[PDB]
Design a binder for these strands. Sequence first.
RNA 1: CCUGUCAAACUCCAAACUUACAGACGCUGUUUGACGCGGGGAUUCCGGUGCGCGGGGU
RNA 2: AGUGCAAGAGCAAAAGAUGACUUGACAGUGUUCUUCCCAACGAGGAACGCUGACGCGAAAGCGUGGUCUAGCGAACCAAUU
RNA 3: UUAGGCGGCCACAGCGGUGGGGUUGCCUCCCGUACCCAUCCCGAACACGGAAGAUAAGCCCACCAGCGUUCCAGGGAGUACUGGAGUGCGCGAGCCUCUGGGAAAUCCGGUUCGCCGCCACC
Lengths: 186, 160, 95, 154, 140
Amino acid sequence: ATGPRYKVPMRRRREARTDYHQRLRLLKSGKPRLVARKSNKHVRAQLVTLGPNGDDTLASAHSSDLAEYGWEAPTGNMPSAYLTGLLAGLRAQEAGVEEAVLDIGLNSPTPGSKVFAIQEGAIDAGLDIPHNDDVLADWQRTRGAHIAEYDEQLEEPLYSGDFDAADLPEHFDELRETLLDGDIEL
Amino acid sequence: KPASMYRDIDKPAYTRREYITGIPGSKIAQHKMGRKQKDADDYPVQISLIVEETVQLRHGSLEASRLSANRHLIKELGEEGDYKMTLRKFPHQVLRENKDGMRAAFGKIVGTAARVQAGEQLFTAYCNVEDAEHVKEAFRRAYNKITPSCRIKVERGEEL
Amino acid sequence: PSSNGPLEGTRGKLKNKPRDRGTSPPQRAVEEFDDGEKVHLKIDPSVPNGRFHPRFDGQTGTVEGKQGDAYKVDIVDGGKEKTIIVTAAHLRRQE
Amino acid sequence: MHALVQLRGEVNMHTDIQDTLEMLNIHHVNHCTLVPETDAYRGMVAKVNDFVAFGEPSQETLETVLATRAEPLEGDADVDDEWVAEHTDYDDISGLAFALLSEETTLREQGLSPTLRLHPPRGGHDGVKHPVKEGGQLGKHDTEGIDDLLEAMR
Amino acid sequence: FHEMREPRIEKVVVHMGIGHANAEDILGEITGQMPVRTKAKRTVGEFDIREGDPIGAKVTLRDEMAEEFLQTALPLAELATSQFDDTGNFSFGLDVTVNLVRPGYRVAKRDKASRSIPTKHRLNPADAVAFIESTYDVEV
RNA sequence: CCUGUCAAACUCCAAACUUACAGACGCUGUUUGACGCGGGGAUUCCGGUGCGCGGGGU
RNA sequence: AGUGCAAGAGCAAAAGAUGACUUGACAGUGUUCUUCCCAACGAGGAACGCUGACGCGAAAGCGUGGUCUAGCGAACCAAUU
RNA sequence: UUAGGCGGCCACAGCGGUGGGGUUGCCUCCCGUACCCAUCCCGAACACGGAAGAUAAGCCCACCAGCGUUCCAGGGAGUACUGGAGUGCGCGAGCCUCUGGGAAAUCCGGUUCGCCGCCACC
Ligand SMILES: [Cl-]
Ligand SMILES: [Cl-]
Ligand SMILES: [Mg+2]
Ligand SMILES: [Mg+2]
Ligand SMILES: [Mg+2]
Ligand SMILES: [Mg+2]
Ligand SMILES: [Mg+2]
Ligand SMILES: [Mg+2]
Ligand SMILES: [Mg+2]
Ligand SMILES: [Mg+2]
Ligand code: NA
Ligand code: NA
Ligand code: NA
Ligand code: NA
Ligand code: NA
Ligand code: NA
Ligand SMILES: [Sr+2]
Ligand SMILES: [Sr+2]
Ligand SMILES: [Sr+2]
Ligand SMILES: [Sr+2]
Ligand SMILES: [Sr+2]
Ligand SMILES: [Sr+2]
Ligand SMILES: [Sr+2]
Ligand SMILES: [Sr+2]
């Protein structure tokens, strides 16, 4: 910009997307990165391996294509986050992927978060990812007990779209049951 | 000291003052002579003094050939004549002299010189048409105080 | 010279041009080479660890196995054989 | 196909240029070799420029040279049409001379020594100090210019 | 277009810098939150040589606790024209500084894919004066 | 803006050239065995000069 | 800018600063390069491994000292385990 | 890719600026703190829960070259410098002929306002 002396950063550092310093440490393991990226409305879960011209995705999972199985509930929450992770690891079991690491990128390592719910979900799918069981959320915040004890504090409804009144975190249980089944169209 | 010791270019480029200390200042006073308020383009004539041989002229030889050269233009055209003379070279090359024996041979700092390649203009004057034969004479005196044989070249002037 | 250290007279080879400054890309730093493969030896000024002796910059060796994550490269220094321990960051695939 | 002929001695000439000359089958002064025009062979004759004399010969001249100066790979014998006919892959001297010029086969391939050992110039050469352009004898000659030398060196 | 362009109060910063402690009490009284100490850099000869030492005290007010403070803070100072920044900010004073801004300043203060706010969407000095003039006081 | 010059310990530039490896051409080796390896015996560690590049010195 | 100190070199969601935690400046044993271009030579040094015990982090991972190149010493003898 | 995720190359991608684009779609700004987590003070951020509105941001899409960067033409220039040879010139520093290479500056004219990979997706 100022002259030939000026150093313009790397593209995905300029864009403030990829953190190369932390990303390097992830690649040092050899195992594929379980890319866990959040969104306001949805949540994504990718399985990425390192390639010649760029990163190869072997198994993705968006919370949009979760509705395709039996979901009418919102897509950017804790019950959804586990199930997006569970789907991802299940697809990956069929791709030959035995083990993987967790990449959160620019997402913060906060105890009991959506990324740590995606990580928990993928491990439960049969994958071997390095974790720490106590940093993960307890079976209940993963189920959706915290959202139910917020809909109990009513006066005015939580959800706008015609789904239900007091909210059903049982839909979590109803999905994990049919995802552990081998018949399911992945 | 005889210029025969420093006239040739054989020593490396020794100009960095952040490494060389105790350097004697320039003997030269004015690099821009005449009427320095007027432009060089306001003049029909541009006669320069061209150096034929690749030399290394000292600040003393520069001051001396600038002095008796400009002093002819102050004599013939007056103290405020219609001219402007210029010395486009600057003394950067720092000189040495070993002054014991050959033990600790790196000499102490004595003076400064300017590296002039062959074909270059040491001096360049810009005058009027009638004052031209006075400047070709200010340069005939100026080449006698420097080391090489010289060409007096007219760069602008088909008025003959 | 004035000194006999490793980084003697290495201003030019161990310094990048202003545009190639900053942190280096992880793609080459995690590159996997096989045994028998040909490599080019060039030290990356951004990367400090996993280097070799500056006297070997510009060598074209042959990989003969690895030591952890770093590579063991076989060169011929004049006439004497040498087995250089170098990380991928400081290697480049030949041809 | 050019005709390289060594005109300057081995003394005082570089080891890397003396080895190139030897790689081009030339070891003594006045010794000649028939060299193809490749990229590899182009850079060899250039490094040897100042100690040699070269150019493409005429079908006429090469024939006169081969007759008087060519020898077998091993042997003292004359190389005439009858010799050529029985060892080589050609009918007469001309079919060898043509194939050599068109760059199809070499002297080695035909059982002949890669060296045409010539006699010192009759009338003397033009000078081992200056090139062809300055009226000397070193470097790339004219087709007619090289013929004068090889024929003077019968 | 006007709704996603009309400004609002982001952070009201109140600061009291002494250099030699007592100023923490009167801010916990007028605002409505816990205050924080301010340290400094570089050695100064006016008995301010120490680096890691409590010199000042400040507070940042977000949302409701910002507007409720300004209802009593603005009818005190005589607002001028040459008291404004190029980005559309003012400071009056005890120091009180308000950071007014457009409905999309999360883009510059977030983590994931940050970007700076363009010169075409940045708050204008004059457009900032017009916003405050519209809520209980005068300009000039 | 206009205008005048520099850099062995400066660099947005930048050769010629030098250099690692590989292919090919040449050359060399497979009874003159190269390349390599092991062993025995040395002499030698006052150098000089021409050309090219130098650093010091009138 | 800073990064202890010469100079050259490295460095920015860091190798810099602040905060908290921590003591890997840990034990043992090697490959390699260097010291000594090529090309034999000690001490010292550096990169890189492995076995053991720790520190930190969610995790990859990083830590065999302070970002790299100076701060070092054979035998005998003296003390110590 | 009618707005997504991960990247490789790491300014041909910078800087600056014009224009256009979103009913249950995507991405956002945006709304809100019971919880998980959070600020040495602030739900600003960080984390979490959610859609009243929104295309003005960002981002995605079309375009401008004024600055910076890449490459190409022609001009400078086969000039500066140079590998090899010379009983070629100069008192000398130095120059020159022949052979093989070959710049940088700057000027005008063009190019460049990113290319490609894996995945997901009316
Ligand atoms: Cl994300
Ligand atoms: Cl090494
Ligand atoms: Mg150098
Ligand atoms: Mg014979
Ligand atoms: Mg005769
Ligand atoms: Mg003669
Ligand atoms: Mg003793
Ligand atoms: Mg003791
Ligand atoms: Mg628009
Ligand atoms: Mg002479
Ligand atoms: Na003495
Ligand atoms: Na770099
Ligand atoms: Na404090
Ligand atoms: Na000797
Ligand atoms: Na040692
Ligand atoms: Na917009
Ligand atoms: Sr000299
Ligand atoms: Sr003279
Ligand atoms: Sr050299
Ligand atoms: Sr270190
Ligand atoms: Sr809010
Ligand atoms: Sr003489
Ligand atoms: Sr003389
Ligand atoms: Sr050419």
